[PDB]
Amino acid sequence: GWQFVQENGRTYYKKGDLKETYWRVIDGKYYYFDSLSGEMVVGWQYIPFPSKGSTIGPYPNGIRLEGFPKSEWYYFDKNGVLQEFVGWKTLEIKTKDSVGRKYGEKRKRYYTNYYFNQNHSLETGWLYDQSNWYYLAKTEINGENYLGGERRAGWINDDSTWYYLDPTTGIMQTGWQYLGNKWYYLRSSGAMATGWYQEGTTWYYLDHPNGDMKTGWQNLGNKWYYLRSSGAMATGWYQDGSTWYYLNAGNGDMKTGWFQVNGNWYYAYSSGALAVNTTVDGYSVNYNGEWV
Amino acid sequence: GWQFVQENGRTYYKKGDLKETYWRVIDGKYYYFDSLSGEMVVGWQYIPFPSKGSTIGPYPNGIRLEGFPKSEWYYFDKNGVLQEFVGWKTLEIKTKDSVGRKYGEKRKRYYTNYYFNQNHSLETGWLYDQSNWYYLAKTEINGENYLGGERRAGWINDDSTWYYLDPTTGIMQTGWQYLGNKWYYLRSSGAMATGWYQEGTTWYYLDHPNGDMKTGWQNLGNKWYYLRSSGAMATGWYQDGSTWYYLNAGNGDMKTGWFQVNGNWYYAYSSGALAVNTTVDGYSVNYNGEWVR
Ligand SMILES: C[N+](C)(C)CCO
Ligand SMILES: C[N+](C)(C)CCO
Ligand SMILES: C[N+](C)(C)CCO
Ligand SMILES: C[N+](C)(C)CCO
Ligand SMILES: C[N+](C)(C)CCO
Ligand SMILES: C[N+](C)(C)CCO
Ligand SMILES: C[N+](C)(C)CCO
Ligand SMILES: C[N+](C)(C)CCO
Ligand SMILES: C[N+](C)(C)CCO
Ligand SMILES: C[N+](C)(C)CCO
Ligand SMILES: C[N+](C)(C)CCO
Ligand SMILES: C[N+](C)(C)CCO
Ligand SMILES: C[N+](C)(C)CCO
Ligand SMILES: C[N+](C)(C)CCO
């Protein structure tokens, strides 16, 4: 008869000398035994999902499968029972000490949030739940890292695109966000915008690649723009000190040389500053920079 | 005839209505005038190089050749004279206020190090000089950025590889370096190593991609290794307190299950701990963990 056997501090499932390895259902509960030694596993594990005839029985004699199940993160209690969790869970963090351990091995505790799918393994990557997006860490097991599933907070970079997850809820943010004394615009997909952004009729410039909203004079594509303190791109006449500048009515680019506004001709030097009360090119201009 | 003319504080170079634009040699010295307005430039400028028939004369029959010369960083004196610098120079930092100004425009100065090539523009990127490598800032003019040429210091990422430049001198460092409480190995080309690195017979492991040297137990490439406190990879029998582990003699990877060393069989549990004075899968092992046949 199949039975649990305690040997050398470890637990095995044996019938005679015959050892179970991989998954087995025992009294309706799921257990898992190390592929090589049969040692029963406890706590966090990154192991093959149960797949008939390779990682869970029956193993009918004869013809072999090629291939092998992908691994997933599962959580087993201190006695080896697979915890069949489904929602959000608060559980211990995954470290060298808390991952891949066997019953009877010699073990401050920290916690975070994880989300279990219907098959009782961890979700990783983007998750839509209760009308919001969340980001759960991608699995990376290397060196001292045992990452995978942890609900993330703050900035994340997915496929070279930046997203912000609220640190308190894990919820992916959209819209204008104020962070580290600066403004960012997250598109309705959550994606951090860079470059020119139009909201209603107002234009904004978000740093490429940093995303932060620019204010003041910006040289962009070899043109000068003035962005107001609010980030809004200025158009028309703008007075900086006692100096006047003209920014193109539609596009916002600063004019230099001779230009006409309301059937008047004005002249701006290379700096963009309006020539006033003087002569330029033989043409007098008045106190309003009108050609007179 | 051709002459400098002042109006509205600005300087132009004109013959009647005709205004010089771009580059011109005047009494053996080089000046440059804004392409649109003819205003003479001063200070730092990022502008096309003098290319005969395009941006410097002669222009036979007034014709300008097609296309447009590559732009470079030049330094003009306050009187418009191009400063024909070569080699290292300490000059004001490049900002909004200090780049692209024209003679007659109204502007604690901050200074930094630059290197001029033989054609009197800034060198950017890798420079070998005085038997050392230096990294000069790549050109990036956009928004508020007017970068290019500045001698860089500290960690820099160039084309996917990290290099470290001394903070005081800018000299590219090589070899083992203890920086911010971690060891890094910089290869003889200066490139920061990641992954396994062998010096002599000892192996070391440097974090990929951050470069810091690892110590302790590390799970790498689906095997366990023990890196001593010097970073050197342990091989053979290793004792931690009571527990014994066997690390593959050459490769260093920890054994589990049954293995053979010096014609004796040994067994390690899944943790790597050697089984001793016990029975394992029906086999007897002695106090040395040796299988007793
Ligand atoms: C909504 N998101 C962009 C966050 C998911 C994309 O796959
Ligand atoms: C959000 N980024 C990380 C893009 C910049 C933040 O400062
Ligand atoms: C862009 N801000 C959020 C800075 C202002 C108005 O929306
Ligand atoms: C250059 N902007 C994008 C600011 C305006 C275009 O219409
Ligand atoms: C504006 N200018 C005076 C140069 C010409 C107008 O037609
Ligand atoms: C930036 N400009 C010189 C172009 C305008 C005001 O300072
Ligand atoms: C300079 N302008 C005449 C254009 C504006 C005066 O208020
Ligand atoms: C610093 N080096 C030139 C030697 C390396 C790569 O460019
Ligand atoms: C820049 N490195 C990646 C080497 C480490 C910085 O802290
Ligand atoms: C420089 N060594 C790598 C020899 C020791 C570092 O800790
Ligand atoms: C895995 N190591 C790189 C240390 C051993 C190879 O020979
Ligand atoms: C090496 N041993 C015989 C001890 C193990 C066989 O499975
Ligand atoms: C060999 N291991 C890392 C698995 C044991 C450390 O204590
Ligand atoms: C001699 N070994 C190193 C085999 C282990 C002894 O307990």
Tab-separated table of C-alpha atoms in Angstrom, chain B residues 274 276-277 285-290:
chain	number	residue	atom	x	y	z
B	274	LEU	CA	25.384	15.166	2.207
B	276	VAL	CA	25.546	10.459	6.497
B	277	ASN	CA	25.150	7.438	8.871
B	285	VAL	CA	25.994	5.292	3.819
B	286	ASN	CA	28.736	5.680	6.481
B	287	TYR	CA	29.817	8.687	8.600
B	288	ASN	CA	31.734	10.059	5.546
B	289	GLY	CA	28.557	9.681	3.422
B	290	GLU	CA	30.193	6.879	1.478
